[PDB]
Design a protein around this ligand. Structure first.
Ligand SMILES: Nc1nc2c(ncn2[C@@H]2O[C@H](COP(=O)(O)OP(=O)(O)O)[C@@H](O)[C@H]2O)c(=O)[nH]1
Ligand SMILES: Nc1nc2c(ncn2[C@@H]2O[C@H](COP(=O)(O)OP(=O)(O)O)[C@@H](O)[C@H]2O)c(=O)[nH]1
Lengths: 475, 475
């Protein structure tokens, strides 16, 4: 049985008080990555190291600096250890990670002609990132200090610098890093200042395994390594890097949905949609989700005719609205919806901007057409969840630039997310399709989506790491 | 000797009247590509097919539809054939090629989050591009109808669709296409609508040889082909594409300068720069030339101390100001210059915006520091010309994304064009270096730049085409 040490930016703990006794309670949320790892075969025990990012987390960390054992179903347990970072460092690294810098870097947000223009802010951001990375590595190693053969799983882009620091003190350990966002083309990656574009690669390559959601991101990562590290040797076929002794395997490990996580509609929506076919676009208040272009394409489709009793819901989950790109995105979507309604008629298009998974799942079930047209997406789990819960045989329009398109693209209407005409034509054809044609397409779609579960993805990581560890050990 | 048929967007002709008789005169501008091709050893005759783009051109075409024999020095001649395109098609294709579309496609101008959004105008532009391409192909083929083994050289991005149409009529001919601008990463190239991103590749690949200025553009082109054409097989080491029976060789053929194009400064500039060191940035009114970031970087350097008797000239060559990206570039430069002067003192930074190549060479000669920091550049010939004429041992700051950096980057201060701190440090370092260090660096820089002449570049195309044609025929 393995001794697992999982590191991620957050370990979702629910903090409340008992309804009977009033005593404070802290319990791990179902479906955490730690919860799923804890259930696998060759796992003896598991520790989870994450950042404290609330007063509740901070009190929890201060009470048990070495971590608390928290219970799971089937009498299983997991040692959860929360790191209290320097608040100034932590806040800056959080700003470093948003579209103010690193989110634009990995998610294709810069035009190059006018943005970005790196100043001293980027240099201080990168220094704070180094301090933050050292926080995690020290706490991870301290938590694993007594384990003979610890297995390290590192998750979330915030932790890409961690594998190098673990490797420095644990030369022989299995280390998996999983990157859940895209990796950009080499030319775009090197937009970043020299110390960042190389320093991030120096931090990741000491992992035994680097996983992405999609082949394209593995390829882009390899091309970035070849472009920027003259000392590295990549093998595009074998998906390997050899660099300064480090032998690294890149793997594609798709994730679709969690069965557990995946009710009522939001207030006003059921009656607003009644008697209408309902186009649903859903995603975070993030520029990549592309709802502005979806609304413009819908308007272009409505001009073609055949959409007289069709409405469109833009369902948004508010997130990092303090970032100017996220707020600008919302403003741009609002402007397009306003122009859509002025041209096609009042209440043709509605934005529903609120945080509630249940409401969104209900929007998935109700949808007569689902639009997941991201400009880019590491994977996009909604495009798996939505067909699985939809019972209206809704077609799915899926951007070719989502990682999910590598798994689902043949079973959806695949589109260039920048081409309004193509997207308008896909909306029209999707809504003109007949009942039995959509039934059969949706049947094959759900069959293509169903196998890609959270537990399969965890199993893929462990199996892939064990094989890569064996390879690294013999070589 | 080969029978050459050169196709390009323009055959530069001077229309005037003889100063003694007053008779009308038309004569080829020296240094044109045709002029150079016509002097090579193995060239029996050359015809130059290009577009009519002025009323003088149009009358010239209507009076000699099958071309004018135009005399060169040493009693050589070139048959110049000008195409009268439909005025509407031509004007739209001219616009198709500006930053309104294809210039941003190949020169990295889109942020993806907010631009581009292709509408019907893109579809109409692509149709008009097809009409224009057919115009050229018919004129080229009609001009070579009596040729038993015509050799086709196709230049300028406007003509990228011409190779397929020549190959359709002339299956065994040597065809070279030379692309003088960057080729973008696969992910970026596929921003374009499906019919454009594949159709341009379909039109290019039947060439015997495709030349770019830099290895990076060849690599990106290959990755684009592999991404979009499933029946294509690329070879990154051999620089080849095999597709539908076509074997295409990709070559890097750098160009540096014409020795012929190597006076007084613009009015007021000599006095204004007297008693100061002079930083010079020079380039077209095109966003890729990056003069805004150069000015901001100069201000950062100035804040670091040491630039008290240093001034900055932003020399601009007005071009395509009717395109909103070019006008906005000028607006942003002007804004940066105004803010630089407001902070550092009146008349520290000046823009001189006019069309006068001799004034620009004069600025190159006066410069104490040269900045060619493009966001991207197919090559950039200014960065060869300027050190070759500069006699002040000026350092050169060269963006790592200019194709020229593959030849000269080791001999310049190579910088990330998006990093103001790095560029300001390079400005500071360049202006602090002593005269002996700068003098030896300039001599090595001149030596590296000197071999890359226009004539060497034409010879490289002829030599490369011949080798690739012999290889394609034997196979
Ligand atoms: N917290 C929250 N989650 C939501 C909401 N609506 C949908 N979701 C879920 O958020 C996840 C979105 O994942 P994905 O599509 O990969 O987009 P990401 O936000 O870029 O990671 C899916 O699991 C959705 O079911 C909401 O209103 N609030
Ligand atoms: N017509 C004209 N040419 C100029 C002027 N200033 C510089 N040039 C020349 O224009 C060319 C610029 O080419 P390059 O640096 O490769 O950039 P490009 O403009 O993007 O092709 C060089 O040969 C310059 O010497 C000017 O004021 N007018």
């Amino acid at each position: 049985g393995s001794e697992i040490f999982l590191a991620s930016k957050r370990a979702a703990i629910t903090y409340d008080t008992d309804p009977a006794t009033g005593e404070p309670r802290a319990w791990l949320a179902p479906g955490g990555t730690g919860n799923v790892v804890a259930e696998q075969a060759g796992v003896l025990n598991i520790s989870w190291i994450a950042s404290a990012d609330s007063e509740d987390d901070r009190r929890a960390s201060a009470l048990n600096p070495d971590g608390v054992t928290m219970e799971l179903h089937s009498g299983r347990e997991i040692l959860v250890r929360l790191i209290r970072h320097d608040p100034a460092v932590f806040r800056n690294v959080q700003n470093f990670m948003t579209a103010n810098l690193m989110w634009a870097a990995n998610n294709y947000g810069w035009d190059r002609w006018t943005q970005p223009s790196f100043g001293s802010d980027a240099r201080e951001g990168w220094a704070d990132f180094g301090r933050f990375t050292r926080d995690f590595a020290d706490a991870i190693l301290k938590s694993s200090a007594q384990s003979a053969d610890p297995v390290y799983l590192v998750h979330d882009y915030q932790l890409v610098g961690v594998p190098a620091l673990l490797r420095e003190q644990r030369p022989d350990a299995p280390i998996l890093l999983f990157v859940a966002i895209p990796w950009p083309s080499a030319d775009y990656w090197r937009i970043l200042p020299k110390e960042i574009r190389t320093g991030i690669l120096h931090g990741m390559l000491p992992a035994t395994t680097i996983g992405f959601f999609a082949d394209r991101w593995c390829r882009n990562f390899l091309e970035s390594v070849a472009d920027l590290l003259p000392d590295a040797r990549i093998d595009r076929e074998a998906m390997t890097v050899e660099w300064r002794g480090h032998r690294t395997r890149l793997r594609t490990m798709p994730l679709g949905y969690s069965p557990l996580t995946l009710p009522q509609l939001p207030e006003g929506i059921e009656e607003w949609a009644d008697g209408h076919r309902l186009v649903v676009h859903s995603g975070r208040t993030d520029p990549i989700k592309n709802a502005e272009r979806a609304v413009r394409a819908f308007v272009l489709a409505a001009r073609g005719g055949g959409l007289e009793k069709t409405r469109m819901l833009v369902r948004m989950n508010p997130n990092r609205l303090y970032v100017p790109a996220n707020a600008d995105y919302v403003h741009r979507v609002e402007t397009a919806v306003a122009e859509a309604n002025a041209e096609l008629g009042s209440d043709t298009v509605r934005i529903d901007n609120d945080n509630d998974v249940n409401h969104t799942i209900a929007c998935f079930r109700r949808a007569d057409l689902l639009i997941f047209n991201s400009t880019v997406d590491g994977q996009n789990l909604s495009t798996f969840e939505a067909p699985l819960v939809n019972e209206r045989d809704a077609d799915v329009i899926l951007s070719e630039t989502c990682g999910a398109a590598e798994v689902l693209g043949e079973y959806c209407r695949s589109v260039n997310p920048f081409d309004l005409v193509e997207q308008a034509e896909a909306i029209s054809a999707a809504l003109a399709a007949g009942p039995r044609q959509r039934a059969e397409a949706a049947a094959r779609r759900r069959d293509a989506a169903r196998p890609w579960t959270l537990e399969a993805w965890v199993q893929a990581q462990l199996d892939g790491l064990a094989a890569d560890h064996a390879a690294r050990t013999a070589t």
